[PDB]
């Protein structure tokens, strides 16, 4: 066994040397003389009420009008953000739900949690009444994230250190992704939906190929767990949030860390991240009840979205970049412009 | 637009009825190591990632959740239970002498105490191996001194209330084990969450009554704190 350890150490040293060799100048020097964005003064525009318990996940719709939010009172609610009406309200079987997804075509929604089951719901039923249409069983841990590929495929990540691909047609697991040593706390489909990442509790992010089912790279540099992740709009980088109270941006092609957003005042972890439409800002929700808009190309903070009375647990930006929704543990959703 | 408004009224009208049931029921989390005897308690009151046990006392409905089919790294899925009425923490008191189960339970309880998301959630404490601790201490196999140098000068606290016909050593050791957790609890508590030690067996009938009364006390304390009386 010692020889294998020595070989692994030598390979790690070689990778470190290559990463050092492929570095010539920091992104700051390249961005030495870019235009500062200036203070951002976004303000609330809406506020949705009706949830009883704290909110763990919200997802948008491809039309940037409807959205779905999940809480641990056992309810899935579909809001019409423009008019704030409630379109649907789904009473869940198990009240411990930790994620929700909205299908790209809008026909189905999915949600899972401590029950270790992903349930697919039908919204366009013949009678119109929403019914449980599928239950995907086979994960050995709580489900922490799920994402639709199309109306007949879904990718899920559970704390059992594995990500899976499901065939909604027969509900049989089609592929298994392995390699993490800690619970997988999130994932993110690529714009072309051929690659995705995952952030585990080992402080490492891995890049997968959806078809072959083999990991391609591994990015390190965080000090503690990673809670959230999201891909740059152009699909050649991404960002992550960690309990060490910092965010870092990795680039696939260069294969090493690019930037870090840290301030002395901030001593709390990040619970979510997301880029704007053009990928020049970086929203991120903190446990100190606030959000911060980071100047991605200079790392200098731009503004703050204060007004939440409790922890920020979820955060999403519409496809067209018109609105930002932020659920929170106070059971409210706020739309900001 | 009219068709949209009417449904919202119907949907909202439904959430009112669901708001009554949610507010009229209490949620309880059931923790404890595998060999702590919790499953016996659950069966007494009575693949899947979680189990349900709904019972009613004094026409008051409770709702208890037993973890299952999950890994041992609790520091992420534990936060989901930051809004429960109280957490039950069954301990294996007689498991003393893995070699040191008691120390494991001590560290787990200490970690629960100091987590920020749990600095307001009350924790009930069960020491659920009394009828085995009795034989362990009586037979002379215990020798708790070796694994606890601090138990050579321990003297039964003055306010002790031993049960009738009890060997003083048994009560002395039992109270000592309780005293460790009560020493952890009463440091940096700050009068926002509490602990309710309760010696118990594995088939004690009054467990439901004890949990009911402790829940009642928790609600009353919270209400009084709202009015700034306490």
């Amino acid at each position, epitope marked *: 066994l010692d020889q294998l350890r020595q070989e692994a150490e030598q390979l790690k040293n070689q990778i470190r040397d290559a990463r050092k060799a492929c570095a010539d100048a920091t992104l700051s020097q390249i961005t030495n003389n870019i235009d500062p964005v200036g203070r951002i003064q976004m303000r609330t525009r809406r506020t949705l009420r009706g949830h009883l318990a704290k909110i763990y996940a919200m997802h948008w719709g491809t039309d940037s009008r409807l959205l779905v939010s999940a809480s641990q009172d056992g309810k899935l609610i579909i809001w019409d953000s423009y008019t704030t009406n409630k379109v649907h309200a789904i009473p869940l079987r198990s009240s411990w739900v930790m994620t929700c997804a909205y299908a790209p075509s809008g026909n189905y929604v999915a949600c899972g949690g401590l029950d270790n089951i992903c349930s697919i719901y039908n919204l366009k039923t013949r009678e119109g009444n929403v019914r449980v249409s599928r239950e995907l069983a086979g994960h050995t841990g709580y489900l922490s994230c799920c994402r639709f590929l199309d109306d007949n495929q879904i990718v899920t990540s559970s704390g059992d250190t594995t990500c899976a691909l499901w065939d909604i047609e027969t509900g049989q697991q089609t592929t298994t992704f392995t390699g993490h040593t*800690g619970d997988v706390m999130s994932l993110s489909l690529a714009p072309d939906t051929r690659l995705f990442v995952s952030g585990a509790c080992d402080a490492s992010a891995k890049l997968w190929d959806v078809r072959e089912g083999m990991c391609r790279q591994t990015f390190t540099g965080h000090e503690s767990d990673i809670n959230a992740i999201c891909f740059f709009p152009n699909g050649n980088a991404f960002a992550t949030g960690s309990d*060490d109270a910092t965010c870092r941006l990795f680039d696939l092609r260069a294969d090493q860390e690019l930037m870090t957003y840290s301030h002395d005042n901030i001593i709390c972890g990040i619970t979510s991240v997301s880029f704007s439409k053009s990928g020049r800002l970086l929203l991120a929700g903190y446990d100190d009840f606030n959000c911060n808009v980071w100047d991605a190309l200079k790392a200098d903070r731009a503004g703050v979205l204060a007004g939440h009375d409790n922890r920020v647990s979820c955060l999403g930006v519409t496809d067209d970049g018109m609105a930002v929704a932020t659920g929170s543990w106070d059971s409210f959703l706020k739309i900001w412009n | 637009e009219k068709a949209q408004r009417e449904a919202n009224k119907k949907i909202e009208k439904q959430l009112q009825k669901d708001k009554q049931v949610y507010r009229a029921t209490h949620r309880l989390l059931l923790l404890g190591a595998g060999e702590s005897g919790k499953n016996t308690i659950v069966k007494q009151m009575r693949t899947s990632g979680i189990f349900e046990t709904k019972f009613q006392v004094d026409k008051v409905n409770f709702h208890m959740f037993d973890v299952g089919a999950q890994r041992d790294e*609790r520091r992420k899925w534990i936060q989901c239970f930051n809004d429960v009425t109280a957490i039950i923490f069954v301990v294996a008191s007689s498991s003393y002498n893995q*070699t040191n189960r008691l120390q494991a339970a001590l560290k787990l309880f200490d970690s629960i105490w100091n987590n920020k998301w749990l600095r307001d959630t009350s924790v009930i404490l069960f020491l659920n191996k009394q009828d085995l601790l009795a034989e362990k201490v009586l037979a002379g196999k215990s020798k708790i001194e070796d694994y606890f140098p601090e138990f050579a000068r321990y003297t039964t606290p003055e306010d002790a209330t031993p049960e009738p016909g009890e060997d003083p050593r048994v009560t002395r050791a039992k109270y000592f084990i309780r005293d460790e957790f009560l020493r952890i609890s009463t440091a940096s508590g700050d009068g926002r969450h509490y602990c309710y030690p309760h010696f118990t067996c594995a088939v004690d009938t009054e467990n439901i009554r004890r949990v009911f009364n402790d829940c009642r006390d928790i609600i009353q304390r919270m209400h009084l704190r709202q009015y700034e009386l306490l």
Partner: nanobody
Amino acid sequence: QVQLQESGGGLVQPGGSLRLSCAASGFTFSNYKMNWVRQAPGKGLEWVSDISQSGASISYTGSVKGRFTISRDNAKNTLYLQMNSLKPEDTAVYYCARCPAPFTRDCFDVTSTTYAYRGQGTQVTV
């Protein structure tokens, strides 16, 4: 990345003494709590000692009190354990452990079967 490297192990007769140095790199040493965890043959993982961020507060397991003196040199980024008065049942691997989050007091999951920030370990035989 997080990487903990130990040293100082070896073989010694009963009542001997050894020093376990823990060379740590890849993070800010002074922001995190620390622990010592050992795994004896045919047994689960165990917890021995700890020390706070600055290094004031200390705590020992039940059956090592008065023998081992945890101490951390935050300047040189290393954790110590001065072993003395060893016994036959001290034989075990010793992992230098790190605590999952900084600035916090709660220190979940250090003893887990697959903790991620735990050291490689050194075998101390008596």
